[PDB]
Symmetry: C5
Subunit: 200 residues, 5 copies
């Protein structure tokens, strides 16, 4: 991070604990983006290395980083190439110069964008169930069904405009017969609080 | 957060996630949240709310409550002035929020967004404990300590007015107790403090 | 706290919550509390007590003890002077507390912490119902575990340090199971705990 | 670490928690290297002492440190720092502070990291060629184990493509053979899911 | 510490360490590192927060009393007595004065010496088995046997020749033969690789 303080312990320890506990859920992307503020490519690589397990997801993230680096190289101190942004062929001093020079070339931000895109891909892939396939079970409380529905919806990552249409149609459509009837009788526009209180 | 523009510290986010994971949604989550988000800007509050794993239904209800409060703000309040969606950090850059919060007289957008979030959290906590104070009753072979713990947890979750707190706590504790401990407590005499009651019922 | 009025730090609250959750209510919670709340204002102490999950009965008893101490203060002690409910932070703004504690040469925060510590001592004494005289070594229980339980109950009781020596010396040997009782009686007077445990283990 | 403030608690505590939870996996090397920034030899020894358990791995690390110290003494015959001076066994804190304020810390950390790499390679006994998908084993878990072993062993990339076909259960073997060459890992896993 | 009160993170980490590791040798360096410049009151606060193991804490208190009596015999603001070093009969102001006076009276260092001696005793008591009694089991992996052997060695805190010969001596028949055939001077990595 940029002075140029070395990545703090607490940050790495918390990042490791997060990736271990939460597995790969949408909350890993904001957490990551918040723990890697102003981080240089070397620091981002140190963060990604400390990730235990999930090595398939890490390999897929590395593949996405290589794809973005190839695209950068095709479209484009010395100028930074694609593998230069990923911190494979650039010293910490070169990165510090690139990011601190005036005008600056924020290589850290670019690498973090690539990593966050890869993480979005990973999150979408770790939630295989589609919005249209989730339906309330027979003897399943409505709360658990709503939780699963909204978790899958956040994993899919569709535009908020489509978010509203899906939230309103699919939630009512896939409800079990009892709660389906209760909700259909509740009336249109019924807020989520009213539905949850009615079904409980 | 502001205290310059320091980025939200790691410890804060990590502890907030750990709290929301461990305690689920209990009354102690509201003070914890309010204490971990001191001087936090709207973007930081949204970063905190995003890191909350699971409980996505409660987060949707919180978002709906925030939209309601924002509509009310816009109705009451038609650099530039901050609109409703600017307080919630949906249509305002970090620089605009910092400018609003650093001016004098400052427009504390952070405090307002935190008020809205705390109202939503009160709703969530009250809804996650569906049993009412008047519906909670001591079991047959349940020690008095466990019944008192459940009773006071439900009472703090309902969070009504203080007069309710005192009257309900003592009257309902004696009323809903099991027959044996009910008799023991009624024999203890009026004014009985909780310590004496627990010592008698053990 | 006033070190300027710094807000209660996150790490402190998180460690306090984790401590109260893991250890339940054991004597070691009181020193921990007193050490984590240095110079804390009444609002900060209330924030700490609020974040305590579960154990709501003990917290209500603590609130009742705080009310008792506030009533005693109000009786003994009739900006303005702080009444009982002002010390507990129920009828005083953060600014009034900061002024009271920062005025040269009345640290109300320390007083509120004294009250809370008295309440916590009562709570700890109540959470250990067994008395020192009721603890006795089991049939096939290692001597180390019996000593651990004995000294845990002794620290929980919070009696006068005067009775500590008499009880530790007489009762520890008295409440031992027959085999280790004979071994220790043969060890001879003036033995240290290390020697006793080495002999029994 | 270089003023010379004493090693902070948080660093030691996180190091202990990491070494305990993750045992000895490749992710321990970056963690160690990041937690010991500017640390003096005494600080590195304080870190190594607090490591609970895994005493066999710690003894192997100590032997590797002695080997590297002997090699240093052979290559390199205030005063000059000997081998046992870098390892902090025959040097006072003041001499270390003077030398680093000759980066003894970086050299000692290089030795320790080499030993830790050896330890990690030894903690993963399974070879890349022995891992094969089970009968009722999800493909994701098989891929995770494969890449974990590959990272532990530290050509590899070329081998990955052959091993993918090799470690494929008959059903998944047919699916992969039909998928066609040059299939990316994302596409491959999406097809096999 | 040197006089801010002991920070939260330090106390919380100390409690978690004493809980997790129980009483193992690695607790002594950790303790010595967490109490740098700590006053006697801070050391007492650290020792109080230790949950459980109250027998070991009583033994530590007895060791502290022994060392305080020895000090009082050897050395018969005011001069610090035995109970003054342990923070039992001295106010925070007296400790701050003793430690801040130009002639350093290290109450922290002396109390920490006493506490570390007691803790070494406790650790030695928690590992009753001797190095010469440890032997590889019938169906026990060689790695676990080496780990137990070296843990016991660290508990004994007594060396290289004996440890290395006894390691091969106390092995299981199969691994004993394998190691004896491996040849002298083989490193532990090679031995473990052969026995794997
Ligand atoms: C990328 C960064 C910089 C960011 C951000 C950012 C900015 C604004 C908002 C935000 C704040 C307040 C409101 Cl009112 C709305 C809102 N209202 S609205 O009804 O759409 C109507 C106005 C159109 N929309 N947004 C998202 C915006 F993009 F429009 C809002 C958000 C909010 C923060 C938030 C989360 C939460 F849990 C509860 C809560 F109170 C607020 N994030 C999301 O809600 C994310 N999410 N998306 C969905 C979708 F799957 F359904 C869902 C959520 C879920 F909430 F988790 C809940 C599962 C359903 N983050 S960074 C690194 O910091 O991550
Ligand atoms: C919103 C913020 C700013 C706040 C606050 C604030 C202010 C004052 C007090 C407080 C302090 C001292 C006293 Cl003596 C009383 C008191 N005495 S009284 O008997 O009512 C009689 C005088 C009328 N009342 N109050 C609450 C006040 F609002 F009246 C008192 C409190 C106290 C702090 C406290 C909690 C605790 F656990 C133990 C303890 F020692 C003290 N909070 C509550 O007690 C909250 N609570 N409410 C109830 C109800 F379900 F029964 C219960 C509690 C429970 F304690 F958790 C316990 C389950 C039963 N918080 S913030 C962000 O920091 O949250
Ligand atoms: C209130 C505050 C400010 C305090 C304090 C304070 C002051 C002095 C001492 C202390 C230090 C050194 C020694 Cl030698 C003695 C000692 N020697 S003596 O044999 O009594 C003989 C001289 C008469 N007595 N004291 C207590 C004093 F008050 F006299 C000693 C202590 C010590 C600190 C300590 C704890 C420990 F775990 C191990 C250890 F090494 C030292 N605390 C106690 O021992 C507490 N305790 N009390 C008993 C009783 F149930 F048996 C027991 C303990 C138990 F240890 F936990 C162990 C279970 C048995 N704390 S605060 C906020 O910081 O809490
Ligand atoms: C008291 C303080 C200040 C200290 C210290 C200090 C100083 C030097 C060394 C040290 C550093 C490098 C080397 Cl090469 C050797 C070495 N090489 S040698 O083969 O003996 C041959 C030269 C004679 N000896 N020493 C110890 C010295 F005293 F001689 C070495 C050590 C080292 C640090 C270290 C630990 C580790 F885990 C792995 C590692 F790589 C290095 N500590 C020990 O090893 C401690 N230990 N002792 C034994 C005994 F039971 F077998 C064992 C260990 C065990 F390692 F845990 C492993 C279980 C077997 N600490 S403080 C507060 O910071 O604690
Ligand atoms: C020693 C220090 C200083 C370091 C470092 C350093 C430098 C560059 C890179 C790096 C960054 C970006 C890219 Cl694109 C590549 C890349 N692309 S490539 O496909 O090889 C093709 C270009 C040739 N290779 N490298 C490694 C380089 F050395 F070549 C890349 C790395 C990266 C950082 C990273 C880790 C991750 F989890 C996901 C991710 F996105 C990126 N580390 C590794 O990937 C390590 N690893 N090695 C293998 C091997 F078993 F297969 C595997 C990984 C695994 F990723 F974990 C995944 C299991 C498979 N670390 S320190 C103290 O900080 O540790």
């Amino acid at each position: 991070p940029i002075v140029h303080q070395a990545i703090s312990p607490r940050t790495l320890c918390c990042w490791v604990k997060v990736v271990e506990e939460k597995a790969f859920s949408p909350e890993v992307i904001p957490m990551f983006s918040a723990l890697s503020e102003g981080a240089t490519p070397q620091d981002l690589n140190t963060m990604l290395n400390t990730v235990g397990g999930h090595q398939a997801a890490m390999q897929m993230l590395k593949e996405t980083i290589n794809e973005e680096a190839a695209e950068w190289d095709r479209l484009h101190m010395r100028e930074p190439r694609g593998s230069d942004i990923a911190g494979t062929t650039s010293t910490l001093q070169e990165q510090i110069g690139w990011m601190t020079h005036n005008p600056p070339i924020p290589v850290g931000e670019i690498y973090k964008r690539w990593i966050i895109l890869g993480l979005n891909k990973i999150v979408r892939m770790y939630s295989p169930t589609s919005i249209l396939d989730i339906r309330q079970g027979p003897k399943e409380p409505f709360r658990d069904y709503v939780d699963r529905f909204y978790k899958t919806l956040r994993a899919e990552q569709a535009s908020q405009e489509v978010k509203n249409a899906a939230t309103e149609t699919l939630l009512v459509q896939n409800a079990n017969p009892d709660c389906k009837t209760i909700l259909k009788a509740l009336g249109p526009g019924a807020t989520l609080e009213e539905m949850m209180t009615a079904c409980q």
